[PDB]
Amino acid sequence: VNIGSTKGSCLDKRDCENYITLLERRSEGLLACGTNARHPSCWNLVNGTVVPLGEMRGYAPFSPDENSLVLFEGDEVYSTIRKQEYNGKIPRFRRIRGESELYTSDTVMQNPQFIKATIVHQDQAYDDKIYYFFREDNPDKNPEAPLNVSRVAQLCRGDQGGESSLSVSKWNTFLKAMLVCSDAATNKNFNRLQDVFLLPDPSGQWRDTRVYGVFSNPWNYSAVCVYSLGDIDKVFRTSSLKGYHSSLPNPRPGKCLPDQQPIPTETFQVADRHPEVAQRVEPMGPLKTPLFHSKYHYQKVAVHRMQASHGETFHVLYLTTDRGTIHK
Amino acid sequence: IPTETFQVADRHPEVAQRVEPMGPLKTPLFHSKYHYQKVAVHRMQASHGETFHVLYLTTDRGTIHK
Amino acid sequence: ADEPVWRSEQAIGAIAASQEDGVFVASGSCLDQLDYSLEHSLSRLYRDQAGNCTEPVSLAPPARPRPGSSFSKLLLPYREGAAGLGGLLLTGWTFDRGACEVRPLGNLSRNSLRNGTEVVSCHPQGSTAGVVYRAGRNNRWYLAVAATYVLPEPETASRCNPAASDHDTAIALKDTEGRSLATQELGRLKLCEGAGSLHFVDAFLWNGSIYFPYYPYNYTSGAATGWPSMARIAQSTEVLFQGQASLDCGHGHPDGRRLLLSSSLVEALDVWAGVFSAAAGEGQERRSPTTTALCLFRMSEIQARAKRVSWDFKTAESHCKEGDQPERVQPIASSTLIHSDLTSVYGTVVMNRTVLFLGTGDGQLLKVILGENLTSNCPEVIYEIKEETPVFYKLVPDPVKNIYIYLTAGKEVRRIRVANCNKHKSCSECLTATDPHCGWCHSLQRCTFQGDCVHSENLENWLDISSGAKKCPG
Ligand SMILES: *[C@@H]1O[C@H](CO)[C@@H](O)[C@H](O)[C@H]1NC(C)=O
Ligand SMILES: *[C@@H]1O[C@H](CO)[C@@H](O)[C@H](O)[C@H]1NC(C)=O
Ligand SMILES: *[C@@H]1O[C@H](CO)[C@@H](O)[C@H](O)[C@H]1NC(C)=O
Ligand SMILES: *[C@@H]1O[C@H](CO)[C@@H](O)[C@H](O)[C@H]1NC(C)=O
Ligand SMILES: *[C@@H]1O[C@H](CO)[C@@H](O)[C@H](O)[C@H]1NC(C)=O
Ligand SMILES: *[C@@H]1O[C@H](CO)[C@@H](O)[C@H](O)[C@H]1NC(C)=O
Ligand SMILES: *[C@@H]1O[C@H](CO)[C@@H](O)[C@H](O)[C@H]1NC(C)=O
Ligand SMILES: *[C@@H]1O[C@H](CO)[C@@H](O)[C@H](O)[C@H]1NC(C)=O
Numbered sequence: 125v126n127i128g129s130t131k132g133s134c135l136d137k138r139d140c141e142n143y144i145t146l147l148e149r150r151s152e153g154l155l156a157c158g159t160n161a162r163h164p165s166c167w168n169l170v171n172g173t174v175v176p177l178g179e180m181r182g183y184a185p186f187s188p189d190e191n192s193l194v195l196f197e198g199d200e201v202y203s204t205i206r207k208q209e210y211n212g213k214i215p216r217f218r219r220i221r222g223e224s225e226l227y228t229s230d231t232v233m234q235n236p237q238f239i240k241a242t243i244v245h246q247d248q249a250y251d252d253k254i255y256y257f258f259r260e261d262n263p264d265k266n267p268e269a270p271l272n273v274s275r276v277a278q279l280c281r282g283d284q285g286g287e288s289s290l291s292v293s294k295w296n297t298f299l300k301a302m303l304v305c306s307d308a309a310t311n312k313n314f315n316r317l318q319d320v321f322l323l324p325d326p327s328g329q330w331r332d333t334r335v336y337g338v339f340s341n342p343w344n345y346s347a348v349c350v351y352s353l354g355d356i357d358k359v360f361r362t363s364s365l366k367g368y369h370s371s372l373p374n375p376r377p378g379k380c381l382p383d384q385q386p387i388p389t390e391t392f393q394v395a396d397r398h399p400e401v402a403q404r405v406e407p408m409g410p411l412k413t414p415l416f417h418s419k420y421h422y423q424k425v426a427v428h429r430m431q432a433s434h435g436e437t438f439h440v441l442y443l444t445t446d447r448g449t450i451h452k
Numbered sequence: 453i454p455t456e457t458f459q460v461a462d463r464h465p466e467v468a469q470r471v472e473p474m475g476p477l478k479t480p481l482f483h484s485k486y487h488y489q490k491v492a493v494h495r496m497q498a499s500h501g502e503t504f505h506v507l508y509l510t511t512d513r514g515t516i517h518k
Numbered sequence: 519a520d521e522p523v524w525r526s527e528q529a530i531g532a533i534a535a536s537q538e539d540g541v542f543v544a545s546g547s548c549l550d551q552l553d554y555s556l557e558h559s560l561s562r563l564y565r566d567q568a569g570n571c572t573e574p575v576s577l578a579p580p581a582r583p584r585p586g587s588s589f590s591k592l593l594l595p596y597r598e599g600a601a602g603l604g605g606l607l608l609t610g611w612t613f614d615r616g617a618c619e620v621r622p623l624g625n626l627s628r629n630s631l632r633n634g635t636e637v638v639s640c641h642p643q644g645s646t647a648g649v650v651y652r653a654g655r656n657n658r659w660y661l662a663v664a665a666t667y668v669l670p671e672p673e674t675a676s677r678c679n680p681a682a683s684d685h686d687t688a689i690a691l692k693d694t695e696g697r698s699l700a701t702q703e704l705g706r707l708k709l710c711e712g713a714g715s716l717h718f719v720d721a722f723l724w725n726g727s728i729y730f731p732y733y734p735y736n737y738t739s740g741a742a743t744g745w746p747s748m749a750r751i752a753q754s755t756e757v758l759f760q761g762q763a764s765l766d767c768g769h770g771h772p773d774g775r776r777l778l779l780s781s782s783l784v785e786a787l788d789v790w791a792g793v794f795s796a797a798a799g800e801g802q803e804r805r806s807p808t809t810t811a812l813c814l815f816r817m818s819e820i821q822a823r824a825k826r827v828s829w830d831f832k833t834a835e836s837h838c839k840e841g842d843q844p845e846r847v848q849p850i851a852s853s854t855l856i857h858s859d860l861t862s863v864y865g866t867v868v869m870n871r872t873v874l875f876l877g878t879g880d881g882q883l884l885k886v887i888l889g890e891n892l893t894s895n896c897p898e899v900i901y902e903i904k905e906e907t908p909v910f911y912k913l914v915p916d917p918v919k920n921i922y923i924y925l926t927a928g929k930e931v932r933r934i935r936v937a938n939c940n941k942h943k944s945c946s947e948c949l950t951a952t953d954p955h956c957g958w959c960h961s962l963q964r965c966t967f968q969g970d971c972v973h974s975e976n977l978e979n980w981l982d983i984s985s986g987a988k989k990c991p992g
């Protein structure tokens with residue numbers, strides 16, 4: 125179904141293609157967004173028809189090789205894609221569609237590379253969280269420290285914004301934590317998060333949702349670690365903040381508020397200055413160690429809970445190597 | 453050593469800056485997937501007077517690499 | 519002329535003259551709506567304490583070249599000629615983390631409509647200059663503000679600096695009709711780290727852009743750093759940096775005058791006036807008959823020489839202070855007027871001549887009329903403060919009576935006459951002084967204004983300067 129760059133063909137032909145980088149089906153039909161010769165736009169495919177919706181910044185990058193990420197939930201869209209080409213060198217996690225636009229501040233991430241995002245429904249609706257995974261520069265600059273580190277971040281879905289004119293449009297509930305995947309027996313660390321896969325529990329308990337992460341290291345060796353939304357959330361609401369040694373503000377940083385209250389300035393400033401929690405998120409169960417590690421270079425993971433002929437249940441991992449193969 | 457000088461040292465024995473390798477690009481002479489345990493070096497001259505450093509390493513497999 | 523003076527218990531921090539409503543002036547933690555005649559205090563605003571206007575904290579006024587402290591930061595009336603909708607007023611203070619509210623232009627006893635914190639400086643000694651304008655498809659009312667938001671806070675409890683992610687904010691765009699006068703993602707201009715503090719003097723609209731006169735300054739040290747400059751930004755809903763440029767006005771002084779005390783854009787002339795000064799010691803020892811000076815600049819040259827370089831502000835195409843340096847702009851040499859203690863300036867055009875009113879540290883109100891070459895003539899003294907009280911850096915013109923000008927000094931606001939034509943009796947004696955306001959009257963044989971003289975059509979009583987003394991009856 126050709127959706128050609130037929131929306132302003134370039135003179136001096138080089139690379140003005142319309143790379144389709146997004147496919148999402150909505151009630152209106154299949155949403156398709158593309159680069160459109162550096163003019164981000166979307167189209168709707170309903171009944172063998174291709175209806176253009178025009179330019180929609182944030183829905184598609186200007187170039188196909190860009191680190192993109194867009195998430196859909198209800199009538200809200202989130203994106204890591206810049207809305208303008210002459211934009212700064214600061215990647216952001218933004219709510220592109222919703223009550224108001226929110227963007228992450230300059231202080232929360234250092235050259236982030238987004239991997240995946242998800243909505244997490246907790247006990248009360250107003251406590252709903254958005255979690256997303258990524259790699260960024262290591263704040264530790266010592267020569268023996270590894271250059272990048274793996275993270276999970278949390279935002280309150282119901283974040284209103286701040287109290288001051290400067291913080292109104294910013295996310296005021298951002299918190300990030302380092303994701304650790306290291307072997308206990310050996311001392312082997314896999315610091316480079318490659319891919320994440322979420323597997324809800326049969327119990328329906330969000331706290332039991334499993335997060336499977338694939339990690340590699342400088343030698344391109346890999347390991348798979350499993351986390352629980354429960355453990356991650358516990359880290360976010362109980363850990364102190366790196367670099368902050370005084371009693372925390374009453375409404376705690378990263379904690380969602382009840383009746384559409386904006387986050388108090390005194391709370392936002394602590395969070396905005398110290399966004400990293402000090403305690404690390406480790407793998408599930410006793411002995412926080414990987415399910416397994418090998419000398420293969422894994423890049424993607426998918427998990428299937430299944431029952432054997434005799435009713436036994438097994439979790440089967442599907443991993444792609446960088447050699448174009450799959451391991452079961 | 454004065455008590456005041458000794459008490460700082462006794463509470464903070466580790467200096468902050470790390471010792472890195474010699475010369476520009478503080479990087480190793482080389483690295484490999486072999487498990488080396490001991491090293492001995494010989495600075496030597498070649499037939500034409502050129503000077504070379506030769507390292508002798510033992511692996512955990514009971515062999516020696518030159 | 520003379521004394522419809524208004525007094526205040528505290529020093530005046532700001533003054534803005536409304537068109538159809540009184541003259542507003544902030545003293546301490548209060549704001550007064552005064553009658554144009556400075557007779558009655560129509561309404562009053564108690565911003566901090568319930569009945570106290572007393573300064574909650576004592577501000578010690580440094581050297582006169584050095585900028586002063588104040589609790590009020592912004593006093594901007596706008597949306598005046600609406601016809602159907604009342605007028606509005608922006609009142610910004612150090613209180614509540616540099617908060618600013620939107621109030622009805624009039625009775626100060628009414629409640630504010632909207633308000634937001636971190637709009638202006640929360641530091642008494644910190645600069646703040648802003649201007650309202652309209653932009654976007656909705657043609658909404660915006661406020662472009664420049665301030666010194668970040669200063670070292672010794673007091674560990676009264677800390678009011680904005681968030682860490684806003685620490686480098688230099689100028690911000692505020693939506694006057696939105697949540698907390700909100701600034702969006704692309705609504706600010708950021709400081710270059712290390713550039714120290716920037717002291718913003720004024721903020722004004724010109725040729726589709728917003729200009730911000732300022733100078734690097736160390737508030738702790740109390741000394742100016744680099745060259746006085748001007749930042750240029752687009753009149754948009756988003757910040758679009760269009761350039762920066764230095765202003766050279768150190769003519770009759772060795773080390774120069776790297777301090778900017780006053781700013782005034784001559785409306786229908788496209789020329790900007792500013793009073794510059796060098797340091798007068800830490801006390802007042804280095805005082806010289808050349809320490810201050812009045813300089814005029816062509817807005818066209820200011821626009822042309824202001825490049826989108828990264829020196830005091832951050833840009834996406836370059837690193838701070840790594841590319842080319844800002845170009846210096848030269849003033850209109852003919853207009854320069856050297857002095858020993860100039861503190862304020864205001865300018866406009868009457869017939870077609872450019873009139874400049876200047877204030878001094880000795881309480882004088884000068885006046886210069888520029889020639890054909892825009893050359894500055896000897897300054898005439900219109901009023902003198904008996905107490906020799908330095909003149910507030912802002913000289914506000916009377917919107918109702920074109921013949922008046924509001925002079926503010928220390929704790930008083932006076933309604934001074936733009937010129938005293940009664941000082942001349944002879945027709946030739948008057949029309950030779952070259953004053954666009956004064957003109958001989960062929961009715962009662964005296965020199966006055968067009969309003970004081972029966973400007974009849976049958977008998978042209980009033981004689982202007984356009985003709986000169988070569989027209990008098992003699
Ligand atoms: C596609 O199907 C939907 C629902 O069946 C219908 O509302 C829509 O009109 C169809 N598209 C067109 C333009 O025929
Ligand atoms: C201002 O409003 C108050 C209360 O509404 C009123 O009492 C006062 O007289 C008003 N000011 C004047 C002088 O009109
Ligand atoms: C208000 O006045 C009282 C005395 O009437 C004085 O003690 C107080 O300092 C004033 N307000 C402030 C905090 O300056
Ligand atoms: C400031 O405005 C807010 C609305 O954004 C309002 O709730 C609050 O009461 C106001 N505060 C002041 C200074 O009266
Ligand atoms: C500002 O002046 C203070 C006091 O002299 C000094 O500590 C500081 O270094 C100055 N700021 C800079 C770096 O210019
Ligand atoms: C006003 O700005 C435009 C640039 O958009 C420029 O072309 C023009 O020369 C400016 N006017 C003056 C008097 O400089
Ligand atoms: C008014 O004065 C200005 C500057 O002195 C000059 O450029 C202009 O031509 C004059 N007006 C006319 C039309 O004489
Ligand atoms: C300066 O004045 C002279 C003589 O009065 C006049 O000829 C000249 O045009 C003026 N300069 C300009 C460019 O206005």
Ligand SMILES: *[C@H]1O[C@H](CO)[C@@H](O)[C@H](O)[C@H]1NC(C)=O
Nearest residue numbers: 235237259260261271272273
């Ligand atoms: C950290 O590693 C990632 C991926 O290997 C790379 O893209 C990034 O540039 C590195 N960080 C820096 C700034 O060197």
